[model samples]
Target: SLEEMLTQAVQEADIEQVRQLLERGADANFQEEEWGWSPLHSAVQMDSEDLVALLLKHGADPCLRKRNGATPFIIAGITGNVRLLQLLLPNVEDVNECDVNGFTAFMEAAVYGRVEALRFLYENGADVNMHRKTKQDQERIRKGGATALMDAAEKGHVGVVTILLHAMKAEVDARDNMGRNALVYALLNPDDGKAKAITRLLLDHGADVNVRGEGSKTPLILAVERKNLDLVQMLLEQEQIEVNDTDREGKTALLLAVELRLEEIAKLLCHRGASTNCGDLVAIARRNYDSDLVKFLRLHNWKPQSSRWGEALKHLHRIWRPMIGKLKIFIDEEYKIADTAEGGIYLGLYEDQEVAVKRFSEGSTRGQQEVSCLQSSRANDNVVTFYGSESDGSCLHVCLALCEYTLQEHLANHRGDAVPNEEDESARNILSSLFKAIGELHRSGYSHQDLQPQNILIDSKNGTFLADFDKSIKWAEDPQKIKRDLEALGLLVLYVVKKGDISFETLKNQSFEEVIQGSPDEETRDLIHHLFHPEDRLSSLLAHPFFWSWESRYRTLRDVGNESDIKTRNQNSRILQLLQPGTLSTSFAQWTTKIDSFVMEEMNAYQDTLGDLLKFIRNLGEHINEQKNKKMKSIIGEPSQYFQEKFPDLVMYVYTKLQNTEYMKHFPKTHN
Candidate 1:
């Protein structure tokens, strides 16, 4: 009975009768009600736009949010269903209504950093700068305090910020609840460099660079606290920047940097000729983010998340707040918030049972789940063990169940982070061992979505394990679910090897010559080969055409593709050699053993997609590239006129940055 219900829930959209049953009175909104999910919510969350239309036509209200005030449109935002959002928008007329947490739809979208969704909402007449309702009455409020620009700037959304500032003519210096402006907000943002860029953008476009925040501190002071050399350099480059400026506390930027022992900040300021002897109140207010410490404070320092404003001012005289003392800890534990620029958290062991934490930010759902999933995995000789969590309120925490030396540490610290012009056989073996662990997980019906470096753990005994199960999607006998999981795995594998973390001989042999040109990071060039190569006998074939076409008979050899010689041996071997340069460099016997191990394990683990695997191999020739490699640095390189001429997203960022350098440079403070 339970299985039937779960299946019914999973397959709700399929059965007309079940749809009717749900509509007739069997609880159209049944789900993890505590999370505020209903049948309609599920449909929207799943991005079943058609199902959403059906559910709504059958009586689902477009405005009916779950307990968290997550309306159908909000769910649509999460899924990035532009059509669904379009359909649902009109149903809810007050597009600016605050959710359970006081964020309007636009604000919520901005906070989520959904660039596309935010654009969509704005185009559909949503306000780009909606203010929150304060405890004060409307009469007391001059204009809605924070605009959409504020939200975007606070989160370091320079593109969105540009739109609000240039297109919408948003007030560049609008003050928030604390009477602090956008520049201050940027300073206080976790990504100081990003904040500085936004601040620079604002200042460039008519922001009074000299305009002091609540207590009189300028952007330079904030930069010092963040130890952001780049930001300081940019500010110093500004002709109008005031070097003698003092915050409310009367501390100049140099005094604060020196007292705080931010040697880098102090050094940069001195280089810029700031006076170190001068002191300002330098005693800035502090916010008790519980475990998270404030990195920088404005003269009248103020920053606000969805919660209330904090009230305490911390003194720079303390030099080392136990809070700032947690540099390694914060970088390791608290930096995993998806919005973080380096928004990923990694747990690594250096030597003798040590652990390291680092952050990376990219995809929100995917990033959030990686640490949790890895933590759920157990210890293995090859893989690091999953341990406890290190979460504050927002950042993800990853504890290793047992610690061991990490591959990255071994490569960087142990081996001077050496690059292998040729393949590294020992590394490939380590990767193959890790791959086997991943295969074992998949064989047991689990798909680790984020299978990459930082997540792959190694022990002293040459044992390897793929840790982090937070992103692991469990397949519950659902074919579609399994297919999606496999696709994710394919992408994950592609992203991982591209980092040059796993290089096989085959990948090295083809190198950049066959792909593009100019030495791309080994991982980048080889990954393209590994992904597109037809001869790789490994489980995740690099061929593009095969994976794209799903209507075909075989998803893999296990399905119904040909077991012909060309399909399996030819392609698989090529890929294996390309990806494991070092390993394949060994004697043929060792290489054969490695391939055999990969084939056996992958066959058992991914029996379902053998057909697709072969199709991938067959179509490999057509996908091969025929272009000269261009050694173009991303930021400093000349713009790709041809490519950008076709798609603006490719070039809009650079164009926007160059056009608005004055504004963007102040945001996103940095070390060097």
Candidate 2:
């Protein structure tokens, strides 16, 4: 009980109670069962000078050992308290005694940066070279036994390092089991305020500047890896430091600098003659898009090996290869500039054929929409052939078949008389072909809302082409938009026949129809009138009599020399007419009138002579099936009774059966 109270009193820093416990016959050298520390060890470590004195006065062993064999002197050294050490050192004998881990008082003072205690310990027989002898000690020896100097250096104790190296002549280049010296540990511990200073101290004391440690990394490489420009510059200034030495990963300081994109560090490495042979310098610069880096490498005799075209295409491919979708067509900048609009346009050779490349301006979505429309719809001969879509940098390009000339250009260049008649066979052929192209568009479920002569293209062989569909809409989305396309077609024909005599508002106000109809263009007027018809179906305009006559004669003459011409003429003659105005209503009226007359005729026969009608029907049955020789009177004994019993609603049943037979054929069954 007295020994426990002494331990408690010593821990509580109570001088009188600790004295009372000792006076009550407690063993003055009483040690803790678990830690084997005497009361003096606790008092010394707690900085309780008076309690420590009382314990020492009551015969507490000042040199009492702990479970790890630590004496009060060693604990005081660890606590870095000069007063505690002074109080215990005068009584303790072995100041250099090591613990289980072979840690001595002088080493503890050095680890805690206790400059004065270290000086005192050194003056009092503390060995500066004293290191631990445990297995861990064998692994931690500054030079075979773990010196106080290495611990002091790693702890960033510049003053303690000076004392260890100058006063005690501690080994500056002494490496521990980690194959690291004082300078190596200084660089490893970057957060130490005095790490740089300690590094300088080691270097000033004839320390090897290029000491290789773990991972085969030298001090200069570690400084560069840490991105410490000051240390890196200083290491470069050292004559013995190798600037090009690589680490375990075969990465030089310059390579790491480039990987990190450290502009200054990379520049510094280059200035210091870092190896360019380590990696591709041009690729590194291009990867980061660093123009300054590229310039710097070029200035240093780094020749980039790629053509301008090759480099441009490679840059485009790297950025947009993934985003351009399944469209894999490539574009080169050397292509000729054929046309230019709000975006860019060029004529180029694609897959060994001439192609018109349209590169959309920034933020333009028409090119994307056009690509989508063409990809979804089936191929049409009138529409331009879409090669594919791709992108280069900020430009999205769409490739299509190149045509001879736009319709606007062709119309401008036409040298015909100012008042050419619409009956001109050449003009009629162009309008016929243009209208057929429009019909093809509608049949493919699309409407070109921006149809105009400028948007169309033509060839030398009179092959009319519909060029632009950027403003087009799918018919399924809004069927009403198809009317707009039809109106544009009407306006196009009117403008062509009128010979630039019509204005925008004139066409908007029925001026083209008046101008063309009043001119010598009788054939054009008839086509324009049909296209502008508001009450008739749009297909009615396509199937009008004028086109059939024009096309029929044209087809006949065009195929006159061929054997297939005869077959083609017969096929054209058999073509069915479109739904004319009021045709369906008139046909329904005639069918209904016929049904009424037939029902009335049957009813009149029955009313004229009921018995005679029944006998005549019996005679007809006997004549039809005479082989049976069965009399009709016996089979149908009573007609009035049959009508009254089973045919109460006979008139209504007859009407329904007639209606079903007439309509059933029109409503065809679709599914099994």
lDDT of each: 0.50, 0.62
Query: What 10-residue stretch in candidate 1 is worst by lDDT?
Result: 305-314
What digit string (tens of lDDT, one per residue) describes model 1 on residues 1-672?
432453355455565655656555555545454676666777777767666776667676777778867777666655665777788876887777665545676776666577677778777777655566544454275434665667777788777777777776577766666465677667767876577778778778766556565456787887777777777776777776787789896788877765665655655565666763474313321322311112332211322111110111111211333321122243323222223234453322222122434343323565566564454345433345544444444554444533353444444444433465332345445545654565455555566655545565555554656665655666544534444433333343443333444343333344334433432332333434443342023344212221211122112211212334324644354332322223212122222232234333423432213233333323421222223212222221222221222222311222222333332232222212
Segments of candidate 2 deviating more than 4 angstroms: 90-93, 136-144, 280-291, 301-672
Candidate 2 has its poorest 10 consecutive residues by lDDT at 573-582
Candidate that scores best on TM-score: 2
RMSD values for the candidates in order, in angstroms, are 28.5, 24.2
* Candidate 1 C-alpha RMSD relative to the actual structure: 28.5
The clash numbers for all candidates, in the given order, read: 91, 2
lDDT of 2 by residue, 1-672 (tens): 878887888787777887777888898888879979787787778877788777777777876788988888888888887877777766766677878777898899898898888888888787777656765545554334567877887788889998888888787877665566778878887664577788778888877776777778888778777888777776777766677788897878887777656778889878887878887766776687878887887787212222222333334334422234433334445434345554556644444344566777535667666776666544677776778766666777777766666766666667464453223444555666666667777887777878877677766455777767666778889887788876777777766655545543466676544645554433445566656555225444544423434334223222221323222333232111111112222222223233234333433342222122223233333343444434433443343232223222322222223223432232222211
TM-score of 2: 0.43
| Global CA lDDT computed for model 2 | 0.62
